[PDB]
Design a protein around this ligand. Sequence first.
Ligand SMILES: CCCCCCCCCCCC[N+](C)(C)[O-]
Ligand SMILES: CCCCCCCCCCCC[N+](C)(C)[O-]
Ligand SMILES: CCCCCCCCCCCC[N+](C)(C)[O-]
Ligand SMILES: [Cl-]
Lengths: 136, 215, 211
Amino acid sequence: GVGRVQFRVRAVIDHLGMRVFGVFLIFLDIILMIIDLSLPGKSESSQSFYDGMALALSCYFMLDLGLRIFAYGPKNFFTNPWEVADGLIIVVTFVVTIFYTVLDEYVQETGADGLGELVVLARLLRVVRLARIFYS
Amino acid sequence: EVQLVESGGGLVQPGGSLRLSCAASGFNVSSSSIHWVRQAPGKGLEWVASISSYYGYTSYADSVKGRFTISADTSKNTAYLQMNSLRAEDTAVYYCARSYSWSYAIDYWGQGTLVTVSSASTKGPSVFPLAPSSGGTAALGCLVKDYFPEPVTVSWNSGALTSGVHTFPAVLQSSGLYSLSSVVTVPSSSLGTQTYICNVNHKPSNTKVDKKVEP
Amino acid sequence: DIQMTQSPSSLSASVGDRVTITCRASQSVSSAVAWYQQKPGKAPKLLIYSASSLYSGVPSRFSGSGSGTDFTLTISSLQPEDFATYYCQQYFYWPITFGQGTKVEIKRTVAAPSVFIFPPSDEQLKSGTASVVCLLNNFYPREAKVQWKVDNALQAGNSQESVTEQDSKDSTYSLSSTLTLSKADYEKHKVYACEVTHQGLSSPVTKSFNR
Ligand SMILES: CCCCCCCCCCCC[N+](C)(C)[O-]
Ligand SMILES: CCCCCCCCCCCC[N+](C)(C)[O-]
Ligand SMILES: CCCCCCCCCCCC[N+](C)(C)[O-]
Ligand SMILES: [Cl-]
């Protein structure tokens, strides 16, 4: 009753195949970003496509996170800094990406300033992600 | 306590050079963005340059690229605009301004410094009285005539008299020299009793004239 | 090279009126638009940042909104100190660009000018030139016509006008017209007059002097 499924999810989440394919998605996400930043004068149609692919990935990491929080339970997952870090990072990156790609008409209602720097911040956090993996 | 005090503007010949400076108080130039924005007389605003020292990041408008250079001395908390190969079209009020960083809105501007690019020579003004005619409200003033370049300041009674004062925008003329009037309305009963002096200051020519205006 | 197309280029409205200024960005800039108020001879001041956030200490009468690439500054209760030029600005792309500005004039009740004429001083006459000044003081609206006459001959081509900006308390203007003559032409004539036409004057007023 709960702790059971919370066990099957980990029996998948833990696995090397999903530990690695999630690592492969991180490289993919960065590669994407480089291409996106290197193509001169791409149309809005093309931009929507690269924005779509960044959001797709960002959403995946959001689910992965919502299970590693569900698979060890909130209380237990929260304690490890090397995990809360990674999760915070995932969220921040997702919020930036969601507004960039989907909710931009409504960005003024956040009252946020320094949009350009928040975007740059979010791109760097995707690289910082691997700087946690490197210790493992 | 935020302040931006700019200096270094003035008359310069086409091809010549000028260095403006912006003294910052109340925040660190080293971690903020500094901007220069210019305004040609009777025109809009044109961004000229930016430095965000924290990123080793400067940026320029194409209209000044190669000729202007922006920089900062973090120890003096001061920014600089080096301006070379100046042209007629570079004539403007140059404002220093700051934002929290490069992707943030500019939130404070200094009062700016006027840059005049011209081959014409500096010339001090002649000052002439506009004497009052013969309760009651009288008008009197002074006419500040034949000067270059802008701009002249006029005060009345060393600044003590401000109420009823209108100092008019300079007009150009055919000579290529400016001319203006400053007028004040006073109680006609004060004439003969109260002394009225216009204090004219034309910095470019180091001219300082005080004119007693009387019936 | 983002173009900010701002309209109207100028407007005139009464105290208490709702005023709207529109800016259209040539392409999307997210919410990186700021609005600035520049009063005459002063540096601009920030009113609104991020399209719709009010900058600290600015009166709430100023609000910003946007829809897509369309940006609106609204002054919802025009105050007489609101006479100024307003500029939108995008700061999302390099280079930062401004709209051409909107000149806001405060509409008040008609006030006729007080008219004063000043003969040239003797001091100036030693220089060989004679400036004759006509002063129109504290009137509204801004439109006014000054006509110089010298012994009833109507002068053309030898005068220059200058107008102050709108006062910030009483919202009026003042105007100065200078007639310029050689000393020789000045001393060939007796009657010097300026005739002022203005809405607040039921018929044109003349001030004159002799010599
Ligand atoms: C909580 C605020 C999150 C905002 C994150 C920054 C999003 C800025 C993206 C704007 C993109 C504008 N444009 C034209 C490229 O679509
Ligand atoms: C994302 C961090 C920035 C926080 C901005 C302030 C949050 C409150 C959002 C409501 C803002 C209201 N308004 C009218 C300025 O948009
Ligand atoms: C050189 C590293 C900077 C990467 C950008 C970090 C996100 C920008 C956050 C705003 C901070 C502005 N600053 C530098 C004045 O602190
Ligand atoms: Cl208010």
